[PDB]
Ligand binder design. Sequence first.
Ligand SMILES: *[C@H](O)[C@H](C[C@@H]1CCNC1=O)NC(=O)[C@H](CC(C)C)NC(=O)OCc1ccccc1
Ligand SMILES: *[C@H](O)[C@H](C[C@@H]1CCNC1=O)NC(=O)[C@H](CC(C)C)NC(=O)OCc1ccccc1
Lengths: 304, 304
Amino acid sequence: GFRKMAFPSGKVEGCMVQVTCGTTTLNGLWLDDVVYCPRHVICTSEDMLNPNYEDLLIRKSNHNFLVQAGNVQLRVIGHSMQNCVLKLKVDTANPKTPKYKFVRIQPGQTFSVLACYNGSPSGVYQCAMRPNFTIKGSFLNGSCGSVGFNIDYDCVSFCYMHHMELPTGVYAGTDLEGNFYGPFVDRQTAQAAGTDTTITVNVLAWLYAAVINGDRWFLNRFTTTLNDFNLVAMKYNYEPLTQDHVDILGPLSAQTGIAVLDMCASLKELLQNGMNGRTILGSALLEDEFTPFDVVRQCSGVTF
Amino acid sequence: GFRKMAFPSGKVEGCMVQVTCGTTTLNGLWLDDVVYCPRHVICTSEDMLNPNYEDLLIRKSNHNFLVQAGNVQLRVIGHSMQNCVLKLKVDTANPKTPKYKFVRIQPGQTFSVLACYNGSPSGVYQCAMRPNFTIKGSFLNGSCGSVGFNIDYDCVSFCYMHHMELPTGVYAGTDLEGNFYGPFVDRQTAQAAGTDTTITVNVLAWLYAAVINGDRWFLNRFTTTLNDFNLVAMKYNYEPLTQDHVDILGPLSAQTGIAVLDMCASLKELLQNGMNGRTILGSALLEDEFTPFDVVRQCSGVTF
Ligand SMILES: *[C@H](O)[C@H](C[C@@H]1CCNC1=O)NC(=O)[C@H](CC(C)C)NC(=O)OCc1ccccc1
Ligand SMILES: *[C@H](O)[C@H](C[C@@H]1CCNC1=O)NC(=O)[C@H](CC(C)C)NC(=O)OCc1ccccc1
C-alpha cells in the first residue's frame, strides 16, 4: 500500500477564523494575538481588476474588519499590510496556538492544505509546490486564506496561503510573509504560469516506493549517465537531475539495491515507451508529488 | 480543480490511544469511558496462525491491558469481546469525545482514514469500501485500530477499524461492532478477496465532476439504454447500473444538462477505446472512489 497522505489537520483547524470586510468574507489564520489573511479582503468586485491596495487600505479602520472564531467576535486593535497579506492584531491570543514556524518552501517540496470556507474546515489533501510555482488543488470562491503546512513532530511549519485561481485551473498564493510563490500578482488579470516541468527526483522517489512495495515490472537491464539521462529529461519537460538529487535518493537506493542511474534508465524507457496500459502503484502515469522524504516517512510510519 | 479530499481529522485525533497487551502494541479508539480495539492485540506471533480467541482472552485480566493517552495511563476496570473487537472500560470518560455514531457503511461509499502508529496520528486519506469489501490504503505493522469515518456537521460517523493486509496489497477490517466487512477472518491465513468490481455510479459521478470543471473531450454523440450499457459493464467488471443509481445522479445530470444515459454512452466508448493517452481531471484511468455526494459536496464547498 502506498497513498497520497495529508498530515493530521487538528492543530491547524484550531487556528482558522473568518474575516469579513464589507461584503467580502474569507479565511484567516489566528496565531498568538495576530490574524493573517489575504489583503484582497478589502476589495470590492470592481476594485479587483486593478486595485490600489495602499489607497484602499487607507479608507479602512480596525472596526471595519470583522473577525469571527466560531461564533465569538474578536476585537481588532491594529492592522497592517505586509506584502500581500493583512495582519490584524486582536486583543486575545489564540489559546489553541500550536508550536509553529513560517517557512518559504522550495519548488518540488510537498505540503498539506486544509481547505476552508467561512472560517470552517472543509477537507485536507497533499500538494506540491510545482517548479512553476503553482499548485494543483480544489479551491472555490471563499477559500482564500486557506493554508498549506508541514508538521515536524509538534511544530507546524506554515508555507502557503491561498489567493487565486489561474486560467489553467491551477492555483497561486503566498508564503505567510505575503510574498507570492512565482511571478503572480493579486489582481484579476490574465496571468501566465510557465511550462509545467515535472519534478524528476520525486518521480524517481515514487519508482523506489513501487519497488519497495513489490511493483517491479518496469525495471530494465540498462543503466545510463546523468548527462545522457538529462538529454531525455529535457525533451519530456523534466527537471535536470543533479548529484544533489542522486545523494538525496541514496537512502532509497541502498534500501532497494537499485543504483540511482539504473532507475534513471528505467524512467527513460518509461518516458520513451509509455506504460503499455500497465500501472505503477495503481497509477497510469508517472507521479511527481512525493518527495524522497515523503516516501521514507510513509514507508517507515513516521508519526507527529 | 477537483481532488481526493479527506475530512478534517481533529475530532478523531483526540480519540486515539495506544493499547498494549504483552508485546503487541496497537491503536485504540477512546469514546466516553470505553476503548475499542482489535481483539488480536491479545495474540502472540504464534497464536496468530490459528488463534482461539475465547481461550486466549480468558488468560487475560483488566491489568494486562495497558492503555495510554499521550503519556497518561488509563485505568482499565472492565473488558469484553464483541465480534472481532475488544471493549475496555476505563475509569475516565474521554473529555474530547465528539458527537458520534457507529455505522456499517455500504459498498461503494467513501470515508476518511486516520492512519495511526502507537496511538499517534501519522496521516489522513480518503478511501472507498470496495464492492469486494476491501480498501486501498497504506497500512504497516502497528496500524491496527486506525479508524475510518465520515463527518456530517459536528457528528463523527465511525465506519471502519483496521485489522489486516491481504496478499493483493489491499486491506480488510471491521465496523465498530467488530463485524468484518466481507468474508475475512482475523487469522494469519491466505484469504481470497473476490473480483474487484468497479463502482459504476461513482465513475459516472466523476465524469460529471469533469464536465462541471471544464474537461469535456470524452462527451460523444451517442446515448444508450440501461440494459445495453450493463452488457458492456459486465465485460469490464463494472457493477450493473440501476434506476436507483440513475436517480442518485439526477442532481449532477440536471446541473450539467447531460442525461445519465448519454454519459453512460460516453463511458461505454471510454471502456471500449481507452483514453488514447489523454487524461480526465488529471487521471489516466477512470476513478471510482468519488460518490455522487462527494462530487456535490466538493463542488459546493460543504464545511463541518
Ligand atoms: C479568494 O477566496 C478567491 C479564490 C478563487 C476564486 C475561485 N477559485 C479560487 O481559488 N480568490 C479570488 O477571487 C481572486 C481575487 C483576486 C483579487 C486575486 N481572483 C481570482 O482568483 O480570479 C479567478 C477566478 C476564477 C473563478 C471564479 C472566480 C475567480
Ligand atoms: C495490525 O497492526 C496489523 C496490520 C497489518 C500488518 C502489515 N500491514 C497491515 O495492515 N495486522 C496484522 O498483523 C494481522 C494480524 C492477524 C491476526 C489478523 N495479520 C496480517 O495482516 O497479516 C498480513 C501481513 C502482511 C505483512 C506484514 C505482516 C502481516
